[PDB]
Each structure stands twice: as C-alpha cells, then as structure tokens.
C-alpha cells in the first residue's frame, strides 16, 4: 500500500512532527576525530558515561570505540586510562546483573574489507571479557534481559528474528543463526534492525530502532535514507505494535555529513527516561555527530521501562 | 639429530652470561611477556608487551611501554591498546609493520586465531590486511633490493613480494618451503628476521618438541634458536640453540606445560659486539641474556627498528 511506504511514512513524520529540543553533545579530549553512533547513555556508580565510535573524519574503515565520561550538561569527555576497542557501532544492555556490550569487527585482506562479525564481551563494565562472535556477515545483533531472567536475542538476516535463550552461557553463532523472523506486516517495504530493546511492565519489549529507503541526488547517486524509529515486540505471538518515525537527520541542526550519500542518516542510540514524561533520544548524525533530541515517551500504552543500564 | 639431543648437547656446552628479568611499571596486576624486539621511538627505547593476568587464558591485550631505567619499561597509559597476542615489529621501506594474533571465539570458546598486519607511522599504525586462517608465525623483513621476504608456516616457507601494497593472504598461504635438512624433528617458527650484509637473512626463531612431566603430562619444550637463510638458493646455515628457559632464573610459569618455555622476541647489537637476547619465559616474564653475535660468517645486521 502507498500509505505502507517508508518514503510516504517518512512524508507525513516530517509534516506532523513536534519540534522540541535538538542538539549536539560536546566530546573532549579527543579533537583530531568525530565521536558519533553511541551506545546509549549509561551509569557506572552513578555517573553517566558513554561508548563512542571514534573516526577521523577523512578516515573510512578505521574506527574505534572508545569510553567517555559525563563531564557537563551535554558533555562527555575521554576517559585516557580506558580499553580502547577496534569495532564500530558498540551497544550497552544489562543482564543477569553483568554489562554485554558488542560491536561490529572488520576484517581485511589487501587492503579491503572482506567481512565482518559482532563481538560480544561480558562481565563487570570496567573489564569487559570477549566470549563470542555472531555468525558472518551479520550486525544489529541485540539482547535483552526478559522478565523471567532469560534473554532475548534479535538477530538479522534485510530480515529481523528473535529468539529466546536460558543465558550468556548459551549465545553463539549457531543460536543467533537459527532466530525466526519477526512480523513483519507493519513494516511495509523498510529494511533497518533494532539498537536498544527495553523490558516493559508488561512483558513486551520496547525497540528503539533504524529504518531506511533509498533516495537519489540530483546526479542519480544513491542517499542511504535512516531515520529513527520505534516499534513494540510482543515474544508471545511474535507480533509488533506502534511502528512510527521518532527523529531523521533534519530534527538536529545543519552539520556537514561524512559524505554525500549520508546527508540524509541518523543512527539511533537510544532513549534515557527524564525526570519530567519525557525521553532524551540519543543517535549518532550523519557518521560526524551524536545528537540528542527531545521526545515523547514512544511506548505509551505498552507499560513502562523497568530495566536500566546503571552499572 | 633430534632436538632434544640438539638441547642436551647445549645445556652441557653452553658459555652463562649475563640473564635477568625486565622490570615493568604500570601494570601491577598483570604479567608482560612475549614482547616484540626492543625499538627506538625519536632515540627513546620502547617495547610492545602481551598483557595477561596470570589465572587468565585467552584474554591478552599488547601494550606500549617506555623504557625508563636499565632493563626498565613503564606502561604509556595514553596509547592505543590492541586486542592481540605475542606482538611483532620490524621498519619496511620506512614504515612500521606491526603484527599480532587475533583470537576468535564462539560460545566462549576459541573458534580460530589470524594474524592482523599494521602499517604506518610507529605513532597511529593502520590495521590493512589479516593473514590465512590459524596461519601464526608469520614475519616480514626488508629485502636489499627494496622488495620484502615473508616467512610463512604450514613447515616454514618463504616469498618475495614487492612491496606491503601486496601484503594479503593468498601470498602468505602461497610460500614454499624452506630447506628443512638442518632442523631434523624441530618445529617452531621465525620472530626476528634481521637483512645481513651479505643480503642472507639472520632469523632470531623458536623450535621446539615434546617432553613429560613425572605425571606423564606433556610439557611443550621450546627453546632459542638462530639460523641464516639465503633466499637466492632457499638454504638454511648455522641452526643452533641460543637458550632455554633454565638460562633465566628460576621464575614460576603460567601453567606447568609452560616450566620449560621461551618464546624470542629478538636482539639487540651491544658496543661490545655481542648482543642482548629478548625473549618472553614461561608465558609470565620478559628476560634479557647476553650472547654472542649469533650470525657470525654471514655479515652484519645492516637494518634497524629506529622510528
């Protein structure tokens, strides 16, 4: 259906939208390179910290991932001590009482990549322990902790699955491989993957995710159009609700992409609870930024947060 | 003509000098060993150092570490860290190559391990090009033509590339081995090829063989080895032990398979002649021994890891 597009969903986002506060996080300590497509906001003994990936801007295929420590309001700076990991794209959840955090690894031959794989590492968030790849070729790999102390894992093939596993213990490539799509019906022709799921009161899984279509420039070059995004999962009868557009790179202010082709790309990190309705939604910017903006709670009706990554 | 013959001869013939251990600053809570050679970083002695909490299996980093006083390094706490083990260095056409091996795990378990090559300024080195799958021990050194040897293992083998723009796994798995005759039953691989004077190649190595504990466990031997290589004629000269894990003093290992383990890192040529012999010892020390000059007859050392 026309209205089940995600160029006409992405149309009427940017013609109802509620514009709130939309902005830049500052990074210090680290001024030769971008800091962008972050972990979600996080606390270790109370004070917020963040993962990066750090790139110099003329830099493809040489990122990092990098801790910073919440110095001010909208302010992170780096933690110099700090492991540094050779990975892009790092997430952050809480399971089981232990920090999983991964991120996507490249591998190269001659100079080229030739693939890549997630990595996953477990234990206390200051000594994180490598443990297990995901299968070949494939990111947006997340867990979740479920409301009876197992562990949800949503894989991707672009085709998004899930599946349920007993403990840390149990993931491996052969698990993450086997996941069985999703629903699908609400996504129309999107493609995209989720970056940060949230337990709910209810028992549902709240995702904050990226969607995305292709686009054309004036010349007919690609733009990889992501936008933000939100749906509801439901384990039970593997069904989704309330698929909507939360944010797209025009929501923050004008700042140069890493290239043409991402002019049009946000990077979703996700959302920390305000002591006011609302949430602060965290994204990565064109691959140069992290921006936070202002929005409604995106999972009303579904039950509250009742997770946390306070470490 | 077996090695532990090789060794036996050597324990009852060989000349003591001078052993100690490095002392490293900075990093109290974890074992350094398996170093890369000793380097100058803008005249400063430098070391790259696989890092290991000792109760830990397969959770090794390699970091930097400054020289600071007579057999003496502390950690530079502000440098880039890698995810590697047993860390390897040598200049090619003005660059830096440096190398480690990356292992992969499934379901907490190790899966497989390749060795990731890194170029560039000594000060931001630039991951290019992983070499064969479970393919370890595999060196680079600077040719006199300007070309670069790469020795390989399988049996160590050895090819001509042009230059690191070449560098993939399909030249690595590609060598062809090496004259074996002088090694008899040894395994083991090269971890310090050094361009002579005479355009041979002087390789710092590791050999091994098996031996056991008096519960009938096995012990995993290796031993310092030396030998040239000329490529013009792919024959080996002068295979011979430089030392044991027993030259160094009495140190606990990592495990008791360990007890009789030395892992080179390389040499360094003194003002006296001789030279200073790095190894890692039983997978928990970095140790320094003097030696003789280890390839007399096949010129001098005509390159260096000055950055």
Same mark, same amino acid.
């Given at each position: 259906?026309?209205?089940?597009?995600?160029?006409?969903?992405?149309?009427?986002?940017?013609?109802?939208?509620?514009?709130?506060?939309? /902005?830049?996080?500052? @990074?210090?300590?680290?001024?030769?390179?971008? /800091?962008? =497509?972050?972990?979600?906001?996080?606390?270790?003994?109370?004070?917020?910290?963040?993962?990066?990936?750090v790139?110099?801007?003329?830099?493809? /295929?040489?990122?990092?991932?990098r801790?910073?420590?919440?110095?001010?309001?909208?302010?992170?700076?780096?933690?110099?001590?700090?492991?540094?990991?050779?990975?892009?794209?790092?997430?952050?959840?809480?399971?089981?009482?232990?920090?999983?955090f991964?991120?996507?690894? /490249?591998?190269?031959?001659?100079?080229?990549?030739?693939?890549?794989?997630?990595? @996953?590492?477990?234990?206390?968030?200051?000594?994180?322990?490598?443990?297990?790849?995901?299968?070949?070729?494939m990111?947006?790999?997340?867990?979740?902790?479920?409301?009876?102390g197992?562990?949800?894992?949503?894989?991707? %093939?672009?085709?998004?699955?899930?599946i349920?596993?007993?403990?840390?213990?149990?993931?491996? $490539?052969q698990?993450?491989? $086997?996941?069985k799509?999703?629903?699908?019906?609400?996504?129309?022709?999107?493609?995209?993957?989720? =970056?940060?799921?949230?337990?709910?009161?209810?028992?549902?899984?709240?995702?904050? $995710?990226?969607?995305?279509?292709?686009?054309?420039?004036? =010349?007919?070059?690609?733009?990889?159009?992501?936008?933000?995004?939100?749906?509801?999962?439901?384990?039970?009868?593997n069904?989704?609700?309330?698929?909507?557009?939360?944010?797209?790179?025009?929501?923050?202010?004008?700042?140069?992409?890493?290239?043409?082709?991402?002019?049009?790309?946000?990077?979703? $990190?996700?959302?920390?609870?305000?002591?006011?309705?609302?949430?602060d939604?965290?994204?990565?910017?064109?691959?140069?930024?992290?921006?936070?903006?202002?929005? =409604?709670?995106?999972?009303?009706? %579904?039950?509250?947060?009742?997770?946390?990554?306070?470490?």
């Amino acid at each position: 259906r026309e209205e089940c597009t995600m160029v006409a969903k992405r149309k009427e986002f940017e013609r109802t939208k509620v514009i709130q506060e939309a /902005v830049f996080l500052t @990074f210090k300590g680290l001024d030769t390179h971008d /800091v962008y =497509n972050c972990c979600v906001p996080f606390t270790i003994n109370g004070t917020y910290h963040i993962f990066g990936r750090v790139e110099r801007r003329s830099e493809w /295929v040489n990122s990092h991932v990098r801790l910073f420590c919440k110095t001010g309001h909208d302010e992170y700076t780096l933690v110099e001590h700090a492991m540094q990991y050779q990975l892009e794209d790092p997430f952050l959840v809480k399971i089981n009482g232990e920090a999983l955090f991964g991120g996507v690894r /490249v591998t190269k031959d001659h100079g080229k990549v030739s693939g890549y794989v997630c990595d @996953f590492y477990r234990g206390k968030i200051d000594d994180l322990h490598y443990f297990t790849s995901g299968p070949k070729n494939m990111k947006d790999i997340r867990l979740i902790g479920l409301a009876d102390g197992k562990i949800g894992v949503f894989s991707h %093939h672009c085709v998004t699955g899930f599946i349920i596993i007993d403990s840390l213990d149990d993931l491996c $490539s052969q698990v993450i491989d $086997s996941a069985k799509p999703i629903d699908h019906t609400l996504f129309g022709d999107a493609w995209g993957g989720v =970056n940060q799921p949230y337990l709910l009161s209810t028992g549902k899984i709240g995702c904050i $995710s990226h969607h995305g279509y292709l686009d054309t420039d004036a =010349n007919g070059e690609v733009i990889n159009v992501y936008c933000i995004t939100s749906f509801v999962y439901k384990p039970s009868t593997n069904t989704c609700y309330d698929y909507k557009i939360l944010g797209t790179k025009n929501c923050f202010p004008e700042y140069p992409a890493k290239a043409p082709k991402l002019i049009d790309c946000v990077f979703v $990190s996700g959302i920390v609870m305000r002591e006011d309705g609302k949430c602060d939604l965290y994204s990565g910017v064109g691959d140069t930024q992290e921006g936070r903006m202002m929005i =409604n709670y995106p999972f009303e009706g %579904h039950g509250t947060i009742v997770d946390n990554v306070n470490f």
